[PDB]
Ligand binder design. Structure first.
Ligand SMILES: *[C@@H]1O[C@H](CO[C@@H]2O[C@@H](C)[C@@H](O)[C@@H](O)[C@@H]2O)[C@@H](O[C@@H]2O[C@H](CO)[C@@H](O[C@@H]3O[C@H](CO[C@H]4O[C@H](CO)[C@@H](O)[C@H](O)[C@@H]4O)[C@@H](O)[C@H](O[C@H]4O[C@H](CO)[C@@H](O)[C@H](OS(=O)(=O)O)[C@@H]4O)[C@@H]3O)[C@H](O)[C@H]2NC(C)=O)[C@H](O[C@@H]2O[C@@H](C)[C@@H](O)[C@@H](O)[C@@H]2O)[C@H]1NC(C)=O
Ligand SMILES: *[C@@H]1O[C@H](CO[C@@H]2O[C@@H](C)[C@@H](O)[C@@H](O)[C@@H]2O)[C@@H](O[C@@H]2O[C@H](CO)[C@@H](O[C@@H]3O[C@H](CO[C@H]4O[C@H](CO)[C@@H](O)[C@H](O)[C@@H]4O)[C@@H](O)[C@H](O[C@H]4O[C@H](CO)[C@@H](O)[C@H](OS(=O)(=O)O)[C@@H]4O)[C@@H]3O)[C@H](O)[C@H]2NC(C)=O)[C@H](O[C@@H]2O[C@@H](C)[C@@H](O)[C@@H](O)[C@@H]2O)[C@H]1NC(C)=O
Ligand SMILES: *[C@@H]1O[C@H](CO[C@@H]2O[C@@H](C)[C@@H](O)[C@@H](O)[C@@H]2O)[C@@H](O[C@@H]2O[C@H](CO)[C@@H](O[C@@H]3O[C@H](CO)[C@@H](O)[C@H](O[C@H]4O[C@H](CO)[C@@H](O)[C@H](O)[C@@H]4O[C@@H]4O[C@H](CO)[C@@H](O)[C@H](O)[C@H]4NC(C)=O)[C@@H]3O)[C@H](O)[C@H]2NC(C)=O)[C@H](O[C@@H]2O[C@@H](C)[C@@H](O)[C@@H](O)[C@@H]2O)[C@H]1NC(C)=O
Ligand SMILES: *[C@@H]1O[C@H](CO[C@@H]2O[C@@H](C)[C@@H](O)[C@@H](O)[C@@H]2O)[C@@H](O[C@@H]2O[C@H](CO)[C@@H](O[C@@H]3O[C@H](CO)[C@@H](O)[C@H](O[C@H]4O[C@H](CO)[C@@H](O)[C@H](O)[C@@H]4O[C@@H]4O[C@H](CO)[C@@H](O)[C@H](O)[C@H]4NC(C)=O)[C@@H]3O)[C@H](O)[C@H]2NC(C)=O)[C@H](O[C@@H]2O[C@@H](C)[C@@H](O)[C@@H](O)[C@@H]2O)[C@H]1NC(C)=O
Ligand SMILES: *[C@@H]1O[C@H](CO)[C@@H](O[C@@H]2O[C@H](CO)[C@@H](O[C@@H]3O[C@H](CO[C@H]4O[C@H](CO)[C@@H](O)[C@H](O)[C@@H]4O)[C@@H](O)[C@H](O[C@H]4O[C@H](CO)[C@@H](O)[C@H](OS(=O)(=O)O)[C@@H]4O[C@@H]4O[C@H](CO)[C@@H](O)[C@H](O)[C@H]4NC(C)=O)[C@@H]3O)[C@H](O)[C@H]2NC(C)=O)[C@H](O)[C@H]1NC(C)=O
Ligand SMILES: *[C@@H]1O[C@H](CO)[C@@H](O[C@@H]2O[C@H](CO)[C@@H](O[C@@H]3O[C@H](CO[C@H]4O[C@H](CO)[C@@H](O)[C@H](O)[C@@H]4O)[C@@H](O)[C@H](O[C@H]4O[C@H](CO)[C@@H](O)[C@H](OS(=O)(=O)O)[C@@H]4O[C@@H]4O[C@H](CO)[C@@H](O)[C@H](O)[C@H]4NC(C)=O)[C@@H]3O)[C@H](O)[C@H]2NC(C)=O)[C@H](O)[C@H]1NC(C)=O
Ligand SMILES: *[C@@H]1O[C@H](CO)[C@@H](O[C@@H]2O[C@H](CO)[C@@H](O)[C@H](O)[C@H]2NC(C)=O)[C@H](O)[C@H]1NC(C)=O
Ligand SMILES: *[C@@H]1O[C@H](CO)[C@@H](O[C@@H]2O[C@H](CO)[C@@H](O)[C@H](O)[C@H]2NC(C)=O)[C@H](O)[C@H]1NC(C)=O
Ligand SMILES: CC1=CC(=O)C(O)=CC1=O
Ligand SMILES: CC1=CC(=O)C(O)=CC1=O
Ligand SMILES: [Cl-]
Ligand SMILES: [Cl-]
Ligand SMILES: [Cl-]
Ligand SMILES: [Cl-]
Ligand SMILES: [Cl-]
Ligand SMILES: [Cl-]
Ligand SMILES: [Cl-]
Ligand SMILES: [Cl-]
Ligand SMILES: [Cu+2]
Ligand SMILES: [Cu+2]
Ligand SMILES: [Cu+2]
Ligand SMILES: [Cu+2]
Ligand SMILES: [Cu+2]
Ligand SMILES: [Cu+2]
Ligand SMILES: [Cu+2]
Ligand SMILES: [Cu+2]
Ligand SMILES: [O-]
Ligand SMILES: [O-]
Lengths: 628, 628
């Protein structure tokens, strides 16, 4: 093949999508039964900047902000990491069955790189999952790595660096795997599903991500965002709406009177901060969760966290003009006057309405209507909330998962070891991992008192090069345990190929209203249950009851890949383990992953997944025996 | 071997050095004819912080600053990169012939790592030189790499990350390869040569290094330091001496009345800023240049740049008390009131003299006496300067290098491509490397109009895996050339094993009084000539004259490994190429190396250097052919 003939552009206009000039363009309205395409992407990862030479007089000159290598963000100048000099990076807009080939060049000084295709199952292409020391060796600076896989699962998916903290510096973007409108289970719910309506909600900091790890005890503890962006832009505001940054223009989202639009909204949030999304005078018809179609539900707002995606339909049926889109930050902020939020503008074709009054932090449009994914799972009879556990999947259970007692039942108590609650770990010749949170506690993350650390080679390709003693030992229970306030080891669960697996995850050291969003690679899962703990009620007691009763909160739960566990609560998930390999399960909050809030599931045995590709990069420690 | 029995401490007190408690301690007064030692170092590279939890109430509490995992710097809190939670990192203090084994663990999120042993020739251990994509593959996060080489060349040497910008974040320290005092050629010039007198002069920024690349056009262009540290500390001062930071205590250097001390001073400067070093009322007897002994010269000050080392003897023969040590920054600073310098305190045993008046930027102690390594090579009859080209080596030429016409004569015009002098490189779908300098020029670095880029594998170990077309093509001249304002390729010179090589390096695009310090790996070299250009006088004309006349500025020039080329000038160097392998030659200013101010010399052919060690890590691009 001449790969260059399949090269896709970084950006597609709505008109190019609707009436493509090139037969090789992958961003298209898919045609049922049409041959799949090869979609080739050439990506360069660089050290780059916000504003700077590509941005001219942005944002005094608003047009300059739209230059194709200009990154505006909130208009605060800082170092960033970019794919192809854009944040978000290029969108991969394709059709179910298309082949995705990405040539990824690492040009970042001193940095290693790997990109994970979040929500893509990678069955038969496990080597492309993009996890350093799990599915591959990271890409060294000066090298290129060719990702090659099929878009064999539908929906709004996601891509980001899975290597250190690079995501929050700007290495992230969207993947949309469209179906033909006539075969999408919810194709009747909308008229248009256009690329410019694939919208990442970003959190943003005015430092690099690395400045916040371990974090700066006195002058800037913790990893809180200062603002959000919708796609590439948004100005920094106080709670009042008063600007405390350059007047970066609000993102515009264009609709047309009398038409229904599919908005594909992504949780491009890397901090612990949730977002409650609402639109002035426009209800949201929710049609998919993490790419998985649901029976439509109409709400006035939804809550989204790191790694989640929600597809909502906006019916442009209001008086044509300009309406406010409100992104309310959910977390603990420095002060009531410094609460984090962002705005955007829903604009009707044919109108040029200027809105005078900027809404405040508390000026959102949830208007006592129903909230999807509400904080603390407040969705009981009469509470005005819908939990993701109460949704109904469009696609029935194909594999007798809901209607059999799970074969494997795993309990994960996630949380923190607080060093201030034990002997001083500093100034005594040891090197314990820590991060500084906003209240100045010194934390390391744990799962069942184990802080995850990586093996020295990816087990998917180099299992035989890895010493057995790196993995947490298996106790008499049949579960991993420590070989102290915590231990560190490669926290690995083995399950047989084809097992029905239930996982119960509990917030065992609750803090700061955190809703930790747990994400499983290689799969989607049914959401079985979620709620807050009652005093006296153990994670073990809940797990045992759910196993013995087979209780679910829906007769056919939604499938998700990322689930935000209620503060001082739990979530239970269930899936059939029919995708062999090594699959990360971790908190999607980037600084929690970075401090060990993770485990791995090995599904099956070597020989169940495909053989190692020829010339696949190898890595490991180099420690030759010293003799005299 | 049990390697742990050879483990060296991170720090050695003067008393431990003078009277070791352990036979295995490598930091010692060397004994002529004593068996060499194995010196084992266990190093962990982490993301860390200045101040923070290890530092208590430093510097209000001055004792807290000395905690063994506290990094005080200038007391401004920021993210750093540390070996064993100290900046400078651990000193390797050994004796000529000792074996150095370093287990280096990479624990830095998203970062690759390699450490270069600057000034160590590595003859027979070329694989340990520490250059990414030249002598090794970088170390991935989660892996350990064991460096194993001999200290087979004497003097004050140096270690630092050779991977991106990590040096200026704190990955650097000293190497001292002592001789027995009775066999050191200058052993008679001093009484003591103690570890606490191995002193790194650091430059320091209040951002991470990565924040300054490419650099921030409007609010913070360029890569200027804000202060210097002597070892781990120094407060931030205005030109007046007024503090604009926390009152971090000045570094103390202890002497004793009536004794002579060898001070081993290192240019741990990563920015373009030179330092003029002087001590109130104390002359400096210079005895070695970059580890190479010289005929002693007495001066009142010396100038030092990035990568250089100068050993000076201080005779503690003044009225006992406290004397000022002055480190004057040489460069272009934001303003006369904001010129960069640092102080330290030379204290005599038995005294507790408090000095009241803080010296200003212009209050140094050069006192019209001679300056070694003066700016612009101002060392002609009557100018009060001594150029490094006028020094005399202690050790005669062993190999008929000075007394034969060089076999290979290489001319390198180093400088910058300024994008503002050509068509806009932004917003037209290309990715040209650039950095923003303080005057807001947009630069890429060149050598003979070539901006260096790395091959995709280290040629030392993987020459047969590298496509020929990555190297700059050889023209009819027999020299590399471009295959445009500049080109990019692996800029490689081949010389035969045993060749006598002369290299002439010229500042062909002079700017901002820059004195670019060029450093050759694997070797030291005679300094043949240095001066400023006259109008009408080409680099080619100077090179040709030096080749045909065999002119030198000394009958037996000093040997150096790093030479600061005069602004709008040149330096000529000469060496015998008897060390086979692949040897980097580059500007030691870190942001110039980072933007391509480098070439490589291949000395000999595969088979001249040792075979690839068993299990040596391999790396390269992964781009399998795409078929239908
Ligand atoms: C979602 O749910 C979580 C968790 O709620 C907890 O679990 C659920 C299942 C349920 O049982 C809840 O009842 C239970 O709270 C909510 O976060 C929690 O919010 C509560 C407050 O509503 C916090 O509890 C408070 O903490 C304060 C601070 O405590 C520290 O500092 C003080 C002073 O220095 C110390 O003295 C103290 O020891 C702590 O170190 C307390 O000051 C406060 O006490 C005061 O108020 C209570 C009444 O609530 C009185 O009982 C008390 O009298 S007395 O006992 O002092 O004599 C006194 O007047 C109180 O204990 C929890 O810490 C907090 N937990 C977590 C994990 O964050 C969360 O609420 C929201 O977020 C928190 C952070 C607040 O901002 C809160 O206002 C928010 O509503 C829920 N989220 C939402 C969206 O509703
Ligand atoms: C080490 O040596 C270098 C290089 O020196 C140069 O080469 C050597 C071999 C020798 O021939 C020198 O004579 C020659 O300068 C020194 O750096 C150089 O320093 C000189 C000044 O001494 C600089 O030249 C000046 O530049 C000024 C700024 O120019 C720009 O901006 C203006 C105004 O916007 C523009 O108009 C202009 O086009 C430029 O873009 C000029 O303003 C200045 O002109 C004024 O002064 C000169 C007399 O020097 C008059 O001729 C002139 O009259 S008129 O012609 O205008 O009609 C007018 O009054 C002048 O040209 C060089 O740019 C600079 N070069 C480099 C590479 O940096 C260095 O000196 C020191 O550093 C510099 C940066 C200054 O800080 C200087 O004060 C320092 O002494 C030497 N180092 C040391 C330690 O001595
Ligand atoms: C707000 O910012 C807008 C964008 O600015 C651009 O992007 C930012 C990020 C920065 O990189 C900016 O530096 C950059 O310009 C700006 O809108 C842009 O204005 C440009 C002109 O200022 C405009 O570019 C022009 O397009 C025309 C149409 O093709 C073209 O003729 C021009 O090329 C020639 O003319 C120039 C004079 O304007 C010459 O300087 C230039 O060298 C060139 O002359 C030669 O002519 C030859 C003919 O034989 C030709 O063959 C050669 O190629 C050429 N020589 C070379 C090598 O160049 C020039 O390309 C640009 O298209 C426009 N962009 C957009 C998206 O609109 C705004 O400017 C304002 O609005 C514009 C529409 C213009 O009316 C401006 O005059 C006006 O100020 C700016 N707003 C404000 C208030 O400043
Ligand atoms: C300026 O800062 C100095 C250094 O501070 C240290 O380093 C910084 C970076 C931070 O990490 C600080 O938090 C850290 O302390 C500080 O000097 C230090 O003061 C320490 C005491 O405050 C001192 O440590 C003590 O050393 C003694 C001698 O061995 C030891 O007895 C102490 O342990 C017991 O006593 C403590 C009460 O002081 C108890 O709280 C502690 O838990 C412990 O009690 C138990 O006792 C058992 C006996 O059966 C024993 O077996 C157990 O181990 C123990 N329990 C446990 C588990 O701990 C304590 O270790 C430290 O040596 C000293 N360091 C240096 C280098 O001097 C300065 O403090 C001032 O000067 C000191 C010399 C003291 O006089 C202080 O009182 C004085 O304030 C500080 N300057 C100022 C003005 O604050
Ligand atoms: C990029 O991202 C960075 C973070 O990485 C952003 O930095 C943050 O910006 C915010 C907002 O500007 C800063 O908050 C301000 O801090 C100053 C200084 O605070 C210090 O000094 C005071 C005493 O002098 C101490 O009390 C304090 O603890 C601290 O040590 C404060 O003065 C600001 O407070 C005032 O504005 C607040 C917001 O309106 C208001 O709530 C507050 O009321 S108050 O009673 O609670 O104190 C203050 O109100 C003013 O009061 C005076 C009278 O007292 C009136 O005359 C004024 O009109 C009032 N001003 C008003 C109403 O605005 C405020 O807290 C963060 O400190 C800073 N964080 C860090 C870590 O730097 C940066 O903005 C981002 N840049 C961009 C472009 O995005
Ligand atoms: C960590 O590292 C960072 C860099 O990464 C350090 O940041 C740097 O700190 C320096 C020193 O504080 C800053 O320089 C100051 O900047 C302020 C603000 O400048 C801006 O506003 C003014 C107008 O309001 C503009 O003119 C200017 O272009 C800019 O846009 C200036 O006000 C300061 O100037 C005053 O102090 C100077 C030094 O003494 C003095 O030369 C100057 O005289 S002046 O005539 O040239 O202007 C000023 O003098 C004062 O004048 C007033 C009357 O006008 C008197 O009443 C006062 O008493 C005078 N103050 C005196 C004598 O001190 C000054 O330039 C850098 O801007 C800053 N850089 C960046 C990029 O942030 C940081 O300090 C480091 N921290 C630590 C702990 O190390
Ligand atoms: C992780 O460690 C905690 C203790 O820090 C365990 O909690 C305790 O368990 C014992 C029983 O083994 C109880 O008697 C203690 O009261 C518990 N302490 C608490 C809850 O603070 C916890 O069970 C451990 N996790 C796992 C999965 O073993
Ligand atoms: C690098 O490129 C420069 C031009 O940008 C070369 O300089 C020129 O050389 C030609 C002769 O080939 C002269 O006629 C021009 O006047 C020069 N331009 C200048 C000096 O601005 C330079 O020689 C190149 N370097 C090498 C080693 O070839
Ligand atoms: C425990 C904890 C963890 C965090 O990440 C955060 O931001 C706040 C907290 O309190
Ligand atoms: C050309 C140039 C390069 C630099 O590195 C610097 O700091 C200043 C300059 O002017
Ligand atoms: Cl797009
Ligand atoms: Cl498979
Ligand atoms: Cl921030
Ligand atoms: Cl609580
Ligand atoms: Cl030491
Ligand atoms: Cl050899
Ligand atoms: Cl700085
Ligand atoms: Cl000049
Ligand atoms: Cu993800
Ligand atoms: Cu994922
Ligand atoms: Cu978490
Ligand atoms: Cu993941
Ligand atoms: Cu070096
Ligand atoms: Cu070197
Ligand atoms: Cu340079
Ligand atoms: Cu080097
Ligand atoms: O992920
Ligand atoms: O170097």
């Amino acid at each position: 093949l001449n790969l260059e003939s399949y090269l896709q552009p970084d950006r597609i206009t709505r008109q190019e999508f609707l009436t493509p000039s090139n037969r090789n363009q992958c961003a298209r309205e898919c045609i049922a039964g049409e041959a799949p395409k090869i979609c080739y992407y050439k990506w360069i990862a660089e050290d780059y900047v916000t504003l700077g030479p590509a941005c001219g007089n942005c944002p005094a000159n608003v047009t300059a902000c739209d230059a194709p290598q200009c990154v505006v963000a909130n208009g605060y100048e800082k170092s960033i990491r970019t794919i192809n000099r854009m944040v978000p990076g290029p969108s991969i807009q394709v059709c179910l069955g298309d082949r995705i080939i990405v040539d990824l060049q690492n040009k970042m000084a001193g940095n290693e790189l790997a990109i994970h295709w979040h929500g893509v199952f990678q069955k038969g292409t496990q080597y492309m999952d993009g996890v350093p020391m799990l599915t591959q060796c990271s890409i060294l600076e000066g090298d290129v790595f060719r990702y090659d896989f099929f878009a064999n699962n539908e929906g709004t998916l996601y891509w980001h660096s899975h290597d250190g903290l690079q995501x929050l510096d700007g290495i992230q973007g969207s993947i949309v795997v469209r179906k033909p409108k006539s075969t999408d289970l919810n194709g009747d719910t909308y008229d248009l599903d256009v690329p410019d309506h694939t919208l990442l909600i970003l959190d943003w900091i005015n430092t690099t991500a690395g400045s916040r790890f371990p974090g700066l005890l006195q002058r800037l503890p913790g990893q809180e965002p200062i603002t959000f962006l919708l796609e590439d832009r948004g100005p920094t505001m106080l709670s009042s709406g008063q600007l405390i940054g350059p007047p970066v223009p609000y993102k515009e989202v264009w609709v047309e009177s009398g038409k229904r639009f599919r908005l594909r909204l992504l949780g491009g949030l890397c901090t612990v901060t949730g977002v409650e999304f609402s639109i002035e005078d426009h209800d949201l018809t929710v049609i998919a969760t993490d790419g998985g179609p649901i029976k439509p539900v109409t709400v006035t707002s939804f809550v989204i966290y790191s790694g989640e995606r929600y597809d909502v339909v906006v019916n442009a049926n209001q008086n044509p003009g300009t309406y406010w889109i409100h992104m309310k930050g959910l977390g603990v902020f420095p002060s009531p006057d410094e609460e984090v939020y962002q705005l955007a503008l829903l604009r009707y074709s044919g109108t040029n309405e200027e809105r005078n009054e900027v809404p405040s932090y508390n000026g959102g449009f949830a208007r006592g209507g129903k909230v999807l994914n509400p904080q603390n799972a407040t969705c009981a009879e009469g509470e005005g909330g819908v939990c993701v556990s109460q949704l109904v999947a469009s696609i029935p259970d194909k594999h007798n998962v809901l209607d059999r007692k799970p074969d494997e039942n795993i309990v994960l108590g996630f949380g923190f070891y607080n060093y201030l609650h034990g002997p001083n770990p500093f100034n005594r010749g040891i090197y314990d991992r820590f991060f500084v949170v906003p209240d100045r506690n010194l934390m390391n993350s744990v799962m069942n008192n184990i802080s995850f650390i990586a093996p020295p080679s990816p087990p998917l390709s180099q299992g035989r090069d890895i010493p057995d003693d790196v993995y947490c030992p298996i106790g008499r229970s049949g579960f991993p345990q420590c070989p102290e306030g915590f231990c560190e080891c490669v926290h690995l669960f083995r399950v047989p190929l084809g097992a029905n697996v239930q996982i119960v995850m509990g917030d065992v050291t609750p803090a700061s209203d955190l809703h930790h969003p747990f994400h499983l690679h290689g799969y989607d899962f049914f959401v079985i249950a979620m709620d807050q703990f009652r005093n006296g009620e153990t994670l073990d007691s809940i797990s045992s009851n759910l196993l013995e009763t087979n209780l679910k909160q829906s007769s056919l739960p939604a499938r998700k890949d990322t689930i935000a566990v209620p503060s001082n609560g739990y979530a239970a998930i269930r899936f059939k383990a029919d995708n062999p390999g090594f699959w990360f399960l971790h908190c999607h909050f980037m600084y929690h992953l970075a401090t060990g809030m993770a485990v791995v599931f090995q599904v099956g045995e070597e020989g169940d997944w495909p053989p190692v590709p020829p010339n696949f990069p190898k890595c490991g420690s180099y420690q030759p025996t010293v003799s005299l």
